[PDB]
Ligand SMILES: C[C@H](NC(=O)[C@@H](CC(=O)NO)Cc1ccccc1)C(=O)O
Ligand SMILES: [Yb+3]
Ligand SMILES: [Yb+3]
């Protein structure tokens with residue numbers, strides 16, 4: 354069974370493996386560089402090992418030290434988004450299982466794709482700068498030299514020097530703080546991660562952060578202006594951790610803290626161990642976007658404990674996490690609610706497949722990422738096709754209680770390891786050996802490796818969806834003389850989730866006639882709704898239906914936050930509207946230099962600019 358990581362230029366785990374990183378760096382805001390040493394404890398997996406190769410991207414290497422002396426190394430030629438391989442010549446050949454420590458002195462580039470450096474103007478407080486990282490999938494190599502593949506798990510410690518007014522946090526347990534001996538305007542924050550993790554989980558923030566406690570093992574961190582609102586928004590967090598522990602087994606990471614990032618954070622959430630990062634666009638005021646916390650919590654088992662061996666197997670991380678996310682929300686709010694969210698996810702899958710096209714290779718569950726940048730291929734597919742496959746399997750094999758038994762056993766089986774789809778499938782067959790005849794009914798080749806919508810759609814309870822579908826059908830089939838029958842009372846029995854689903858249904862049939870959209874604004878006043886998911890879908894419906902009044906609203910939401918879920922389609926829709934096209938491109942050009950580097954790249958590709 355031969356499997357190597359095609360996104361990594363480092364020596365693979367079969368040659369050598371990193372066991373520990375001790376990181377000592379200083380955050381230089383004047384220069385937008387992180388400077389320090391990465392000491393890697395590396396274990397040879399081979400006899401007579403004399404060299405090894407590490408991933409780097411846009412790093413400046415000052416030197417490499419083993420056994421107190423400088424050693425030879427060479428940087429290869431850059432291999433586009435993969436970066437440049439660093440070969441290091443070991444001073445003494447290693448036997449199998451021998452471990453050494455390699456200390457690499459390095460400096461990042463200001464344009465590190467792992468990092469966003471924010472001026473004071475780009476923060477809430479307006480007095481201090483801010484830095485955050487995002488290493489998933491393959492940007493850890495833009496921060497430090499490493500075997501940048503999830504097929505290798507290491508523990509880590511780190512000492513981070515920062516201006517003394519600021520606070521540093523990491524994906525790790527805080528292990529104290531002191532004044533910096535070599536510069537008193539500074540502080541050193543120390544950190545310890547005792548659980549082996551893939552390098553994509555290394556995370557760093559530095560900024561003017563304050564914390565508030567919201568449960569026995571949870572602090573919320575943000576700038577001061579966001580603290581009170583974040584505490585309320587994420588108050589279900591401890592109750593979700595308890596349900597998750599019930600489903601997954603023991604939470605092993607100690608703390609579960611939340612960090613609410615500035616608005617340019619590119620994702621809804623990122624499951625950094627001990628410190629989940631979230632977008633401030635979750636702060637709807639009513640806890641209605643909390644499925645995102647349920648999702649990040651669930652990664653504490655599926656993803657951070659049982660990890661995909663390479664990114665071709667990313668659905669293992671996300672499809673399982675969505676399956677557990679939806680169970681948490683099902684426990685809190687009922688089984689009809691789990692089916693409603695499950696049925697919504699099928700529609701998001703329809704969208705993604707329609708968008709790439711039904712034979713596009715990114716619509717496959719297991720993807721081949723050789724020479725594909727993971728950020729380009731990134732979509733809802735591994736989430737929703739992965740969830741669809743699990744929910745189909747749940748229904749085939751006897752229901753949620755039985756399938757949840759399999760999930761817990763799966764996590765116990767593969768804790769602290771990195772696995773492939775074939776490892777998952779083999780264990781699925783082993784666990785359900787008394788139901789192999791059922792298992793053999795599944796069209797594995799189609800579910801796993803075929804493009805498009807899955808060969809079979811699961812059964813979904815429709816109770817909560819029906820009202821959404823009816824209202825959306827009323828609007829789609831309305832003629833001019835029917836617009837007067839709509840009224841704000843149409844919405845009185847719909848939850849925010851149902852309103853969001855009404856908009857998703859209607860957006861799938863966009864455009865609507867412009868008079869319909871204007872009437873919808875007259876009677877429902879969707880312009881007033883600040884809930885980001887609902888506002889996103891409503892602005893998209895308005896732009897796709899060619900409402901000029903919506904252009905400044907859509908542009909302002911595209912640029913005042915940077916969650917890619919929202920920014921990328923808003924910009925794409927604005928460019929596809931002839932009236933807003935020149936402005937969409939201009940606004941992108943003007944904002945580009947102060948955007949997140951990955952977001953800037955993808956919006957550029959979407960708009961075909963550069
Ligand atoms: C498209 C994008 N997706 C994410 O941010 C997900 C990232 C993730 O998988 N974290 O674990 C986390 C997530 C999971 C489920 C719902 C929303 C967000 C987004 O929502 O902005
Ligand atoms: Yb300690
Ligand atoms: Yb009529």
Ligand SMILES: [Yb+3]
Pocket residue numbers: 962963
């Ligand atoms: Yb150009």
Ligand SMILES: [Zn+2]
Pocket residue numbers: 648652670671674
């Ligand atoms: Zn996830």
